[PDB]
């Protein structure tokens, strides 16, 4: 769905939403498009192990440096493991193959760090982390459901983009969480802050597509 997201962003950005007449941004809000999932917390320990994250439903996941993935459901015991070849298996923290001991231990550490520390973003209407990268200004998180989340480090603003809803959720500096239909942003416009971040988003989606 990355190509679909790129086309949706091309379209909003070509409409010059902050550059025409009266902006009626509120008329572009669509609460029926609120995301089901987003990333509420993350820990980059990629110099050694990988990227650990919490989703807004309190489930956790890790994308390990070897491109395997472990996902802990919010029941606190049920696990999904995804091997390098895509094979998915189900198990629990209590009942697992000995070969997963190290990875399960690592997940417990990430999980405990994100339970004890850090603020839950978006404090909804499982996807796993397909890929991520960081720039100087942001971290870019691409979920397997097609959603792309962009967290800006300096000002703590965030975008959650969903190509299925063709929607963007913008979390501003005050932590106000508004969800917009992209095509309604074309129709009604938006502020220059949101417009700039959507221009950036397009560049990030191009980076995802060109590196997938």
């Amino acid at each position: 769905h990355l190509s679909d997201m790129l086309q949706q962003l091309h379209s909003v950005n070509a409409s010059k939403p902050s550059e025409r007449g009266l902006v009626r941004q509120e008329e572009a809000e669509d609460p029926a498009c609120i995301p089901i999932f987003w990333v509420s917390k993350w820990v980059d320990y990629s110099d050694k192990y990988g990227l650990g994250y919490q989703l807004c439903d309190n489930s956790v996941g890790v994308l390990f440096n070897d491109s395997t993935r472990l996902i802990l459901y919010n029941d606190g015991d049920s696990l999904q493991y995804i091997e390098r070849d895509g094979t998915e298996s189900y198990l629990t923290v209590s009942s697992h193959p000995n070969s997963l001991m190290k990875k399960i231990t690592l997940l417990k550490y990430f999980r405990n760090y994100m339970s004890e520390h850090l603020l839950k973003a978006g404090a909804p209407r499982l996807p796993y982390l397909r890929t991520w990268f960081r720039t100087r200004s942001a971290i870019i998180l691409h979920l397997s459901n097609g959603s792309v989340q962009i967290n800006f480090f300096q000002d703590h603003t965030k975008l959650i983009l969903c190509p299925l809803m063709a929607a963007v959720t913008y979390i501003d500096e005050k932590r106000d969480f508004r969800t917009y239909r992209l095509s309604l942003l074309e129709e009604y416009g938006c502020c220059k802050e949101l417009a700039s971040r959507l221009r950036y988003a397009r560049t990030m989606v191009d980076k995802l597509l060109s590196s997938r």
């Binding site: 990333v39 917390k41 993350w42 820990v43 980059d44 320990y45 760090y113 520390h117 850090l118 603020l119 973003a121 967290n151 480090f153 703590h156």
Partner: peptide, 5 residues
């Protein structure tokens, strides 16, 4: 940053 807020 190496972790979220």
């Amino acid at each position: 940053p190496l972790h979220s807020t």
